[PDB]
């Protein structure tokens, strides 16, 4: 029972209400603990370690080298772009779910774990309406500075690039799904740019008919308006403030050029990390209107030695 | 505890290690005491929280001052719809940032406010609502009246829903004077559910906001969220987006909606009294504009709705 220091109390019994149903009745996972799939003519495996809502639950990925399954990182070792020309997204939250999973950059082999707020396992406030994940071999490296009295400076989220599937079908937790890029939008808070890639599943019923942000409204109306407003508000119950979203949306080609730049950023972090371990081991309403452009590469920036890299 | 997914990966289901309870209840806003006295429209009322939340007989009873005693009253029938100030009274059923689906029960004695029940279990919203939400008294979307554009539409068969875009969080059960700003329409599943957009009397920008277009200057994106929130809030269950008419009502078209539905309410109460002495893609549906059509005179009011 929750004690409100007011005379009306709250019983807090979870057997008479639909909270548990609301959150978990849309879970979409692989059938078995160890699950083998084939991506880009190669064979890999996803392993569910421990149980959901446990504080050391993680999703491990392996590759079949010979007769054995060797451990791999989904950030480093799964191919960003397929031979088809499509990209692989790593589904971390399935459609309609609330469980805030993330690829842990600071964990060995970058396993997928649940985020933790205030010391407690994090759940979304609202049900997300799209399959949500990250692109491999991408990185919003904060070494690079963006710009717009005197200018305002912006950096990256310091995590891999976020990606959205507007597909109808609910994907699975941890699944690697080939996806086609459609566009992108940006969240600008805390002074850093958090890019969100909008993409469509390879196997969606309208894959070939949708090729830009404007083709969606003909087959899946309002996903673009809903997408922005969802990310605008999804934390309003705790922050009591709306997130800032730039008025400028990227088209399909501006988004594919974004994925590459962040891949090159990823290949500069990995270089900076090897050099650094031989060195010392051997209102704001029109703040949304601004147009942001590259500025300079801070050479006083030191890469995070906490993030695991092979 | 463990949730059955009929698969090998299980769910611990412990509520002490996660932020679910925090997400839902950390923004509850209620009156301090069980019995609370308030003054609305120069009259004196009392509010009684009966029972505890998440129990199967929790309800909010309302009383009025009939000299010498406090008499039971219904918030739907006996609270004044429009005040002498020119303001309307909203009866808050869902607090800002909260999930608990409370409703005025038309089929319950004195129309007490109880928690809704879905599939036999106490109903909670899927997402946190971002505005104070309630209903207008002495209003009724009477299904006797049919609308057209052929395709026919009827009423919600419930009192008019109203939204407060005010910043301040109101209280569960609170009766709040509000100024009307506009309205939007939902067209499922063949009936019109009008949603009135209004602002709290006591909001810091009360006098600066007098239309739906004034909101973006003090509370940006409130109007876009309103449409999208109600568009999807049951999508996790229905797997489909709700339909919302493309036409938004201005301040005067909404006040004419409130009064039109008030006349509907003053026709339901008379028609029920007359009946009881005799005993011995969808894109278009959003673009379509609806107009009135005929009053089905073979319609008999619902005798389950409690009436004094």
Residue numbers in the entry:
A (entry chain A): 37 to 184, 190 to 323, 353 to 380
B (entry chain B): 36 to 184, 192 to 322, 353 to 380
Manuscript text:
The enzyme inorganic pyrophosphatase (PPase) catalyzes the hydrolysis of pyrophosphate (PPi) to inorganic phosphate (Pi). This is an exergonic reaction and can be coupled to several unfavorable and energy demanding biochemical transformations such as DNA replication, protein synthesis and lipid metabolism. Family I PPases are Mg2+ dependent enzymes known to exist as homo-hexamers in prokaryotes and dimers in eukaryotes. We report structural and biochemical characterization of these two apicomplexan PPases.
